[PDB]
Design a protein around this ligand. Sequence first.
Ligand SMILES: COc1ccc(S(=O)(=O)N(CC(C)C)C[C@@H](O)[C@H](Cc2ccccc2)NC(=O)O[C@@H]2CCOCOC2)cc1
Ligand SMILES: [Cl-]
Ligand SMILES: [Cl-]
Ligand SMILES: [Cl-]
Ligand code: NA
Ligand code: NA
Lengths: 99, 99
Amino acid sequence: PQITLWKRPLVTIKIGGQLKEALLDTGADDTVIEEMSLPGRWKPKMIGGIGGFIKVRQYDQIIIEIAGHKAIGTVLVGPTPVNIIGRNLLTQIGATLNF
Amino acid sequence: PQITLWKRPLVTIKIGGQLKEALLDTGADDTVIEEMSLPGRWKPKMIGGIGGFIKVRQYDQIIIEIAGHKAIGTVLVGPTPVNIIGRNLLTQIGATLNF
Ligand SMILES: COc1ccc(S(=O)(=O)N(CC(C)C)C[C@@H](O)[C@H](Cc2ccccc2)NC(=O)O[C@@H]2CCOCOC2)cc1
Ligand SMILES: [Cl-]
Ligand SMILES: [Cl-]
Ligand SMILES: [Cl-]
Ligand code: NA
Ligand code: NA
């Protein structure tokens, strides 16, 4: 699809057996999801943006279905105010910004 | 152009006769740039990023070139890890997300 930017570019994702809404975010290096459990190993990380930093858990090799398209990569889990699909997964679904 | 997302989507902007680097950010409703001098009056705005809420200065109707494309619109001035071009100006330059 061609997604407009007149509104937030929100899509449905499936992660850890759960459906969630998330923002397609070209400004995000990494994918960040609100608190949830995921299986496997994790390690702590700090990520920063407007307003400063939050502590997250870094889970590697997580599959996420994004608007119907599967992709695997690292997912950060923590107290983000919005679920964010970042570049690490946007590349894997072939997303581009066009103008 | 068609911009892929394997690296950060950084572009040159021109504001106030000066060239700066900025990030094309579909996850940002608004455009936020680092401390600089802009003409005219400003109004207060609170914006909430990943780390919390901050105060910024809102300047309306500012001339700004984004990757060679002219725009005239609202610019927020305040502390940010990088200048971000949000949807208010991405729509003016005709950007969409595609996959
Ligand atoms: C390392 O991976 C990262 C992933 C995401 C972020 S971020 O969420 O902080 N962010 C980075 C950007 C500030 C460089 C992505 C943004 O797209 C962020 C995404 C976002 C959106 C809403 C709330 C929290 C985060 N948007 C944002 O800050 O927009 C501001 C703040 C909102 O006000 C209106 O727009 C301006 C930081 C690190
Ligand atoms: Cl990854
Ligand atoms: Cl590609
Ligand atoms: Cl505007
Ligand atoms: Na893992
Ligand atoms: Na000033």
